[PDB]
Design a protein around this ligand. Structure first.
Ligand SMILES: CCCCCCCCCCCCCCCCCC(=O)OC[C@H](COP(=O)([O-])OCC[N+](C)(C)C)OC(=O)CCCCCCCCCCCCCCCCC
Ligand SMILES: CCCCCCCCCCCCCCCCCC(=O)OC[C@H](COP(=O)(O)OCCN)OC(=O)CCCCCCCCCCCCCCCCC
Ligand SMILES: CCCCCCCCCCCCCCCCCC(=O)OC[C@H](COP(=O)(O)OCCN)OC(=O)CCCCCCCCCCCCCCCCC
Ligand SMILES: CCCCCCCCCCCCCCCCCC(=O)OC[C@H](COP(=O)(O)OCCN)OC(=O)CCCCCCCCCCCCCCCCC
Ligand SMILES: CCCCCCCCCCCCCCCCCC(=O)OC[C@H](COP(=O)(O)OCCN)OC(=O)CCCCCCCCCCCCCCCCC
Ligand code: FES
Lengths: 168, 149, 102, 146, 154, 248, 40, 62, 50, 60, 53, 229, 89, 223
């Protein structure tokens, strides 16, 4: 139900961007939003199917009584990190966010930055905390820091204020 | 549960009473009723005809009229002769289907797949290990369609 | 016979020349009967030959994907869109068959 | 436009752009069009034969008729509105858009170096008394007969 | 100009009757006609599934046909034959009988493709006294024919 | 044959037993359902025909007209000659004053003809054309006159033969419009003299209007049974094929 | 566009009418008709 | 009825002011009546169909 | 922009550069024959030398 | 019979009837006129189709 | 015109096509001259047919 | 020839081979009349006592348009410039009462006042407004987004983007009034129940062969417009 | 889920590639739906558009089961597994 | 508490509508079963009086309303008030009030605008002894007593005509304009004309009385 509730959030967002935005460029921006967010959701879905099939259970508690090997743990952590970083925009995947903020209506932009991206932080946290991972987090830390550096270095050359807020 | 009496006009209704949703039994599974003629021929089934198969034919004759009318409601650019001929054709087809159903009922009674008025000397004991339908049927109309819930 | 991804091109012309009701009926006939029997060949009817089947299917699947990941993006006809939808779903179901026979 | 208070309305006759056409049957036609319109719309309003126009001009948001062509446009969709433009006007038209050229060279009927898609033309002042030829365009799908 | 609605209705009725024959079915799991056909639960369930889906599609077609009649009686007769013969493809027991049933159904599908409407009454009055070539009918027939040939020989 | 005998028996029962019973029940239900929602509803009525209305001793004589629209209103002393046309939504009030319409005269859609004074006659000659949304009061219009759409002809107006009043023009009271002169403007002033191709254009305009009136009169006088036949024929033509048209 | 009513019933709108007097007399043959309400 | 009442004893300004005020009052009354009718049109469906919808949702979910 | 979207876009465009939008009969027959022959070749190559 | 402006005896017969109506072949099967029509029809079909009638009926 | 689609009848002429449609010269010759051809006139269509052949 | 008790007027009349077409949610007042080749879009209102003739040429009318009460719309037959003489009306077009329309083209979002005369060959461009009592001379072009007035129409000024939005909003507001008018009507006409029985109604002079009924498969058709025959 | 249960990660990867490419192939047409005005794509009969009620009701049912079919998917899975259990027995 | 009455009224109206529709459908089915085509009669659906849900036209017995006319919605008519042939009064948006001894011509169309500014009535108000000529168009206007309007005149929203004023035929009163008492105005951009005299006012009153008498005679003849 956790994964299903995370997945349920896409259709209203796409509908709002498609039917309520006044700008003409918002038609393609909604498609970009959908395609990136759904690629991330597909990665998360692969990880969830892995966990469900290996451990025939749906409770966070039962994971305390099952151990994942090194290979499965590495696969799961990579999949969940990349999938939730598609929505909570990590460095190489923020083109959709920039386009969607530039073209979307102001209220939905407030909702998207203020709350929607946070939905990726929560779920990741849960799946990060329920599994024992024996990998070095240096690669993920480097990806996040590259995101910070790349976003903050691009703020000077912005004339549109909404794009500047998106980069922040 | 109780089934309709055979060799009576309502015997064909036993075709709608089943014990399990299976189409057919297993290769070595015993039929629910004693066998009269396992390797029956065409005239063996015809000789086994009685009031139940005739009741099936009569029901087909009764229900064929509204069905033929409903089919006939789709005609355009037609004359009286063609309309009457098409109605006759559809009605005769329904009669043929009723005859086919009666033949199948007689064959089933010969084989022992449906109630033929005989009971096995030894009952095949079955333990109702999995039960999702007994109380639901007992609180419903579906108790009529099930045999030995 | 099924016009699957390696040989999917003629199905586009067939769909182009057909009315919508014909495509309706052809799609139901194709998925319900033709593709189901094609699946049951490897699953049920000829399972004893799976040790020879799988690799072949695998190769075809790969080829099909790499044959259509770009061709489906230079079409401009409604019938072609419908036919390619059917083709993509057929490839996905073939991959599912490969998973099943393992 | 440019008007002052109390002025009278201009005449539609003085605003007509004339198109001279050679038919598929070798006969001559004269067609009235207006600026800011596509050639396809004028041809279809005047009921000119030889054009099929399967896609009916394309999409409605990022079109080929906008003076700067938007990069994420999809271009023409059927390539069944072809016309042949005479030398001076065709030379003034300029080089083809890459998508329009791709659709033109991919048609089932033979084309020329002066071939040009009608829905990709925006009627201008300098197109007055322009000479074009319309040989018959190909059919594509089943619904073209309907 | 006959409206084929009643024909479709007839199909539905007969198809529905076939459903009845399955609902009251009884027998053993075995083979019949010289071990050329199989009678077991899975085959009969596939038969029932294809029947009911065909019936649903036919019902929606019957609803649609009254908006605009662009189809002939032979079209729905071909549909009748296809819906009569495909579940017997489900009931096959050898590759021989499956092959023969598949050619029967392929011929029925070719018959359906043949009887497609070619010319229409429209509002295009510019095409009189000129020859317009469509070529869609020929392509459909040609490709179906040769694909059937290749599949059958292999 | 028992199947045909059963088929024949059912039709008689449906026609003689089920049909009347359903009709009675439906009529009773419709009657009782209309009373429930009163006075917040209305029912369909029988719209009266205002083609021939007689007041006191004013009997219209319009039997010679080639076309009278069923929507038109003609009251009082209205006399029309042969080949006359009165189009949709036109009002003619000869109760306020006698109205004379000459041969081949066309009065277009939504035209009012009524004298402002109680004892004034409105006379319109032969081959006259009066366009839609026109107002005419106590006028003397001579033969072969043309009056454009949305035009007003006042209580003292005398138009000579072959006089043209442009569309959207109000001819002031007590105005004589001479022959072969085009007048235009919100107050009508002498604009121009007619040119022979303009006369020809007006002539074919009048002729096509007369022939249109003939076609409309043919169309609008069909009975109930012909209208149902036309509806069925239009549906069938929508359902026909190329072979059917060739066979016809 | 706004579609609410402005003639409210809860209270009367505070206004005066001495400002913007209408002409109502002494008209010429070329000037326009005077305005109606004029309340501020 | 102010409109049907004789107002020839007043000046034209007084007559038009009286007519305007009467029209405004009647307009307000009509607006109130229409608004309450539309309010009833809103209220009835809630009472009629809220429970069946909740029953449908509850039977679907739990 | 480029390395994430336009790489795939240009790959698809350049691949479609070598595609006939309209099927011709000779191409259809040649495709069938090539599929048969070289599926057989690749399977026998895997069987023998791999 | 008008009841509150509604006529309960309203009746307009349909002019659209089959040409096939009142034909001899539409009389009940077994009638003399029906037998006459059937005799005329059967002879006409045999004359056009002699071999077909022979084959089908004789074989049956 | 009855039984003629959208074809309209004008003054002095029945009309041969829908309004705003191009008049065909070959059909005009067919209607006016049933079978009379004084000479084999080489129009643009005839020359185009020759070039195509 | 005349003197019938009950009017024979039909709102929608089809001259042979020229049949009108009406889109969904479109209300033609039963008092109004539409003859010939007239095509009308979706959510279009034609108010009471209006005449629309598409006899000598076709008439095409867009979606969200309003036509006033005493409006006559008809075509000419030919134009001096050789352009088509059909009437073309855009998508959000307001035509006021007592207006005449004759063989012209009017683009989207155009307002025509009450009492106007639009003559043959006129071209009114998108966003234009014509005041109440005005006549557009034949073969005249009205520039887009401009306001015109006078019997010979003369230029007044350009229209700001606020005026055009107000006109579009006014066009959009006509839908629900027409919807209420439609809701006042039931799909089944009961006017036939108030007539007596005539000799011809019970005994036809001649009979016709059965064919397809004009309402074949009507039970499966949604009764979207109650005014349908 | 079944592929992961059968331990086929390569099949999962190829299905993922196919799924994402097909998803863009499908959602690309949502951009083409934008139109300047209403399309007017309905057939006319008796001078008025012909709107079918039976096909409308069929679409209503299909829309219900498209929107909320995930709630009742368990019963369909039960029935399909019951049918599939007969394959070997 | 009145909301309960409104709810009950709406429920009763809906049940009555259901019953009427079911009865008409049964009668049509009886048609078909009887081979009857009377219910296929394409008679005119025009209604002389068309009431919107709670807006019902209200008038005295002394009013003449032509069978060609159409009063729709809230239309209130005073005594001895005549509506001509083909006139339309649409008060679906807002009411239309007409005084007594008032004559409305044949092609007069009266309607109202959606919204107006504060202090401006949005309905249409017509006083007593008022003559409106044929072909007039009126929208959301106030007309005082003893006012004559000539034929083919257009009066727009927010216009006020004071008592005793005369509007010449073929004129337009611009929106939100006052026309003072005892004056004659003419033109499309309506312009001032000399003040009225006693003889002109007497003639106008006599003409209005004669028109009312003729309308009453026509009504008596119609019945
Ligand atoms: C209205 C026109 C209808 C169609 C007419 C044209 C088609 C005619 C078809 C053949 C008719 C003649 C058949 C002759 C042989 C049978 C004669 C007969 O009735 O015998 C009665 C006898 C009845 O007796 P019995 O079968 O009970 O027993 C035989 C006799 N003893 C007891 C001694 C053994 O035989 C039958 O009825 C046998 C029927 C067999 C049917 C086989 C069908 C196979 C279908 C395969 C389909 C594959 C796909
Ligand atoms: C007021 C209340 C009073 C009290 C209650 C009174 C109730 C009286 C009425 C109910 C009882 C009537 C008699 C029984 C119902 C009629 C028969 C019927 O519906 O049968 C369903 C059918 C039976 O098949 P089954 O029994 O499995 O056959 C095998 C051997 N017998 O089953 C099947 O066909 C099996 C399932 C087929 C496959 C289904 C799953 C796959 C498809 C799912 C999606 C479908 C989408 C649409 C497809 C097209 C069909 C529309
Ligand atoms: C939130 C909705 C209520 C809002 C508050 C309310 O009732 O306001 C009063 C309003 C009438 O407004 P007025 O009288 O002008 O102002 C008085 C201010 N209290 O009252 C109204 O407008 C009354 C109608 C309100 C809107 C419709 C009713 C909404 C709630 C219906 C619930 C019905 C029960 C559902 C569950 C059980 C079903 C069996
Ligand atoms: C060998 C033929 C077997 C069938 C006929 C047997 C002889 C018979 O009954 O003939 C008499 C019968 C009518 O009597 P007849 O004397 O011909 O005429 C005077 C009566 N009005 O005559 C007949 O019925 C005519 C028989 C014609 C036989 C033709 C043989 C070849 C074709 C046979 C087709 C089967 C159906 C024949 C009848 C079709 C309908 C006329
Ligand atoms: C996008 C779609 C992704 C679909 C899921 C599959 C992705 C590739 C998985 C490859 C894999 O599972 O390889 C097996 C291999 C097992 O390694 P093994 O030797 O058993 O133990 C580690 C100690 N050397 O595994 C390994 O060696 C490590 C596997 C994880 C590598 C990092 C994550 C890669 C992306 C997922
Ligand atoms: S009309 Fe399709 S490309 Fe121009």
């Amino acid at each position: 139900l956790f994964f299903m509730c995370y997945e349920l959030l896409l259709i209203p967002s796409f509908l709002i961007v498609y039917f309520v935005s006044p700008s003409r460029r918002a038609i393609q921006a909604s498609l970009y939003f959908v395609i990136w967010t759904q690629l991330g959701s597909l990665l998360v879905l692969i990880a969830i199917s892995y966990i469900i099939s290996i451990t025939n259970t749906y409770e966070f508690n039962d994971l305390k009584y099952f151990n994942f090997t090194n290979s499965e743990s590495t696969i799961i952590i990579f999949l969940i990190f990349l999938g939730f970083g598609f929505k909570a925009p990590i460095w190489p995947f923020h083109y959709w966010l920039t386009k969607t903020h530039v073209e979307a209506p102001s209220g939905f932009s407030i909702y998207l930055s203020g709350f929607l991206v946070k939905t990726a932080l929560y779920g990741f946290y849960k799946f990060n905390t329920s599994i024992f991972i024996d990998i070095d987090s240096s690669i993920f830390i480097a990806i996040c820091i590259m995101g910070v550096v790349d976003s903050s270095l691009k703020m000077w050359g912005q004339t549109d204020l909404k794009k500047l807020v998106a980069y922040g | 549960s109780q089934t309709f009496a055979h060799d009576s006009f309502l015997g064909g209704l036993n075709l709608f009473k089943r014990r399990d949703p299976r189409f057919v039994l297993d290769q070595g599974e015993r039929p629910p009723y004693p066998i009269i003629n396992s390797n029956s021929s065409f005239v063996d089934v015809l000789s086994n005809f009685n009031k139940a198969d005739f009741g099936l034919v009569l029901f087909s004759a009764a229900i064929g009229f509204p069905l033929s009318r409903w089919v006939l409601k789709g005609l355009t650019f037609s004359s009286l002769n063609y309309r009457r001929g098409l109605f006759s054709s559809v009605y005769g087809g329904v009669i043929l289907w009723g005859l086919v159903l009666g033949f199948n009922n007689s064959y089933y009674r010969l084989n022992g797949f449906v109630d033929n008025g005989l009971v096995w000397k030894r009952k095949e004991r079955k333990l109702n290990k999995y039960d999702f339908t007994s109380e639901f049927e007992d609180n419903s109309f579906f108790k009529k369609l099930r045999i030995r819930d | 016979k099924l016009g699957i991804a390696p040989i999917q091109l003629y199905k586009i012309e067939i769909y182009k020349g057909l009315p919508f009701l014909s495509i309706f009926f052809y799609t139901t006939f194709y998925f319900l009967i033709f593709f189901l029997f094609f699946s049951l060949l490897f699953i049920y009817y000829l399972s004893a030959l799976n040790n020879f089947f799988w690799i072949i299917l695998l190769i075809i699947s790969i080829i099909g994907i790499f044959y259509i990941i770009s061709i489906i993006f230079d079409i401009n006809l409604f019938k072609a869109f419908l036919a390619y939808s059917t083709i993509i779903n057929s490839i996905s179901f073939i991959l599912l068959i490969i998973a099943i026979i393992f | 436009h440019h008007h002052h208070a109390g002025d009278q309305a201009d005449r539609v006759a003085d605003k007509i752009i004339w198109i001279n056409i050679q038919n598929r049957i070798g006969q001559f036609e004269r067609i009235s069009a207006f600026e800011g319109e596509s050639l396809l719309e004028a041809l279809q309003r005047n009921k000119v034969a030889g054009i099929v126009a399967t896609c009916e001009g394309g999409e409605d948001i990022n079109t080929m008729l906008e003076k700067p062509i938007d990069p994420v446009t999809y271009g023409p969709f059927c390539s069944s509105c072809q016309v042949v433009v005479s030398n001076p006007w065709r030379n003034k038209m300029g080089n083809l858009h890459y998508l329009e050229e791709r659709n033109l060279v991919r048609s089932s009927y033979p084309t020329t170096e002066n071939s040009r898609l009608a829905c990709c033309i925006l009627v201008e002042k300098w197109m007055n008394e322009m000479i074009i030829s319309i040989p018959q365009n190909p059919n594509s799908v089943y619904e073209d007969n309907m | 100009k006959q409206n084929p609605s009643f024909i479709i209705r007839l199909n539905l009725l007969l198809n529905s009757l076939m459903v009845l024959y399955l609902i009251t079915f009884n027998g053993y799991s075995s083979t019949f006609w010289w071990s050329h056909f199989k009678l077991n639960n899975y085959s009969l369930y596939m038969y029932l599934l294809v029947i009911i889906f065909n019936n649903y599609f036919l019902y929606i077609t019957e609803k649609h046909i009254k908006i605009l009649n662009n189809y002939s009686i032979d079209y729905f007769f071909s549909i009748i034959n296809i819906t009569l013969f495909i579940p017997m493809i489900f009931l096959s027991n050898t590759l021989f009988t499956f092959f023969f049933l598949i050619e029967l159904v392929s011929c029925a599908i070719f018959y359906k493709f043949i009887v497609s409407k070619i010319s229409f009454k429209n509002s295009n009055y510019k095409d009189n006294y000129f020859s317009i070539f469509s070529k869609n009918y020929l392509n459909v027939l040609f490709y179906q024919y040769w694909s059937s040939f290749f599949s059958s020989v292999m | 044959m028992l199947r045909l005998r059963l088929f024949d028996a059912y039709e008689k029962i449906s026609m003689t037993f089920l049909g009347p019973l359903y009709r009675r029940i439906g009529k009773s239900l419709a009657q009782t359902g209309l009373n429930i929602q009163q006075p917040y509803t209305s029912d369909d009525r029988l719209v009266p025909s205002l083609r021939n209305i007689r007041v006191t001793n004013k009997i219209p004589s319009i039997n010679d007209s080639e076309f009278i629209a069923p929507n038109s209103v003609v009251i009082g002393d209205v006399i029309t000659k042969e080949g006359s046309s009165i189009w949709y939504g036109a009002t003619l009030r000869g109760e306020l004053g006698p109205i004379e319409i000459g041969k081949q005269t066309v009065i277009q859609d939504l035209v009012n003809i009524q004298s402002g004074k109680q004892n004034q006659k409105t006379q319109i000659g032969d081959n006259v054309f009066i366009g839609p949304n026109s107002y005419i009061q106590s006028s003397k219009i001579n033969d072969n006159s043309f009056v454009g759409m949305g035009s007003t002809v006042s209580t003292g107006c005398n138009l000579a033969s072959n006089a043209v009043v442009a569309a959207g023009s109000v001819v002031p009271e007590n105005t004589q419009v001479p022959s072969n002169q085009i007048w235009a403007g919100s107050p009508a002033q002498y604009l121009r003299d007619i040119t022979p191709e303009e006369r020809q254009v007006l002539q074919e305009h009048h002729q096509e209007c007369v022939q249109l009136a003939r076609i409309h009169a043919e169309e609008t006088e069909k009975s109930f049974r012909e209208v149902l036949n036309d509806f069925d024929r239009i549906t069938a033509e929508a359902e026909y094929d190329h072979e059917s048209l060739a066979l016809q | 566009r706004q579609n609410f009513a402005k003639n409210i019933t809860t209270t009367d709108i505070p206004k005066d009418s001495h400002h913007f007097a209408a002409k109502r007399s002494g008209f010429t043959q070329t000037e326009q008709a005077p305005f109606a309400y004029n309340d501020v | 009825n102010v409109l049907l009442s004789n107002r020839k004893n007043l000046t034209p300004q007084e007559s038009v002011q009286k007519v305007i005020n009467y029209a405004l009052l009647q307009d307000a009354k009509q607006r109130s009546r229409t608004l309450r009718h539309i309010k009833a049109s809103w209220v009835i469906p809630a009472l009629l169909f809220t429970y069946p919808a909740w029953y449908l949702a509850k039977g679907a979910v739990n | 922009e480029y390395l994430t979207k336009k790489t795939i876009d240009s790959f698809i465009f350049n691949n479609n550069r070598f595609n006939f939008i309209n099927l011709v009969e000779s191409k259809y027959f040649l495709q069938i024959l090539t599929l048969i022959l070289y599926l057989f070749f690749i399977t026998i190559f895997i069987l023998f030398y791999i | 019979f008008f009841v509150d402006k509604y006529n309960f005896s309203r009746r307009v017969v349909d002019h659209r009837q089959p040409y096939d109506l009142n034909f001899s072949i539409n009389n009940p099967v077994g009638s003399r006129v029906w037998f006459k029509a059937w005799k005329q029809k059967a002879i006409g079909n045999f004359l056009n189709l002699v071999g077909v009638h022979y084959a089908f009926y004789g074989a049956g | 015109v009855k039984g003629k689609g959208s074809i309209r009848k004008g003054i002095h002429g029945e009309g041969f096509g829908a309004p705003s449609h191009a008049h065909d010269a070959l059909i005009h010759q067919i209607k006016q001259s049933k079978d009379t051809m004084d000479y084999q006139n080489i129009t643009n269509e005839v020359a185009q047919n020759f070039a195509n052949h | 020839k005349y003197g019938e008790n009950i009017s024979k007027h039909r709102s929608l009349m089809s001259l042979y081979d020229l049949h009108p077409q009406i889109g969904y949610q479109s209300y033609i007042a039963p008092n109004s009349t539409v003859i010939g080749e007239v095509t009308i879009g979706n959510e279009t209102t034609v108010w009471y006592n209006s005449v629309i003739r598409g006899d000598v040429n076709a008439v095409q009318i867009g979606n969200n348009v309003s036509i006033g009460e005493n409006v006559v719309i008809h075509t000419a037959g030919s134009l001096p410039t050789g352009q088509p003489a059909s009437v073309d009306i855009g998508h959000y077009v307001i035509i006021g009462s007592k207006s005449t329309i004759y063989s012209c083209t009017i683009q989207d979002e155009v307002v025509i006042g009450q009492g106007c005369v639009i003559l043959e060959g006129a071209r009114i461009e998108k966003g234009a407004m014509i005041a109440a009592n005005s006549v557009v001379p034949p073969g005249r072009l009205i520039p887009a987004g401009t306001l015109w007035a006078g019997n010979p129409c003369t230029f007044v000024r350009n229209l700001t983007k606020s005026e055009l939005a107000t006109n579009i909003d006014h066009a959009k507001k006509q839908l629900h009034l027409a919807q209420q008018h439609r809701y006042e009507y039931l799909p089944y006409n009961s006017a036939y129940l108030q007539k007596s029985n005539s000799e011809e109604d019970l005994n036809p002079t001649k009979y016709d062969d059965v064919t397809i009924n004009y309402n074949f498969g009507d039970e499966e058709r949604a009764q979207e417009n109650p005014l349908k025959y | 889920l079944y592929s992961s249960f059968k331990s086929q990660y390569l099949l999962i990867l190829f299905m993922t590639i196919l799924n994402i490419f097909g998803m863009y192939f499908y959602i690309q047409n949502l951009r083409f739906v934008v139109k300047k005005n209403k399309s007017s794509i309905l057939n006319y009969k008796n001078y008025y558009v012909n709107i079918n009620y039976s096909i409308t009701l069929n679409i209503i049912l299909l829309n219900f089961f498209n929107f909320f079919g995930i709630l009742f998917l368990s019963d369909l899975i039960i029935i399909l597994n019951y049918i599939s259990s007969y394959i070997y027995i | 508490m009145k909301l309960f009455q409104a709810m009950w009224t709406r429920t009763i109206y809906s049940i009555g509508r259901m019953v009427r529709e079911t009865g008409l459908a049964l009668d049509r089915y009886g048609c078909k079963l009887e081979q009857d085509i009377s219910c296929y009669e394409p008679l005119s659906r025009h209604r002389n009086i068309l009431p919107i849900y709670d807006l019902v036209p209200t008038f005295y017995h002394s009013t003449f309303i032509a069978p060609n006319s159409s009063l729709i919605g809230a239309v209130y008519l005073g005594q001895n008030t005549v509506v001509g042939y083909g006139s339309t009064l649409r008060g679906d948006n807002h009411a239309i009030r007409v005084g007594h001894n008032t004559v409305i011509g044949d092609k007069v169309a009266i309607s109202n605008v959606a919204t107006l500014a504060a202090g401006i009535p949005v309905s249409t108000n017509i006083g007593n002894h008022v003559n409106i000529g044929a072909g007039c168009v009126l929208q959301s206007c106030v007309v005082d007593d003893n006012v004559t309007v000539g034929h083919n005149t257009v009066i727009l929203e927010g216009s006020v005509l004071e008592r005793g004023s005369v509007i010449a035929p073929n004129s337009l009163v611009p929106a939100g304009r006052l026309i003072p008492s005892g004056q004659l105005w003419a033109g499309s951009p309506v312009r001032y004309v000399r003040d009225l005299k006693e003889e002109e006012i007497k003639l106008n009153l006599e003409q209005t009385e004669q028109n009312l008498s003729i309308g009453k005679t026509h009504k008596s003849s119609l019945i």
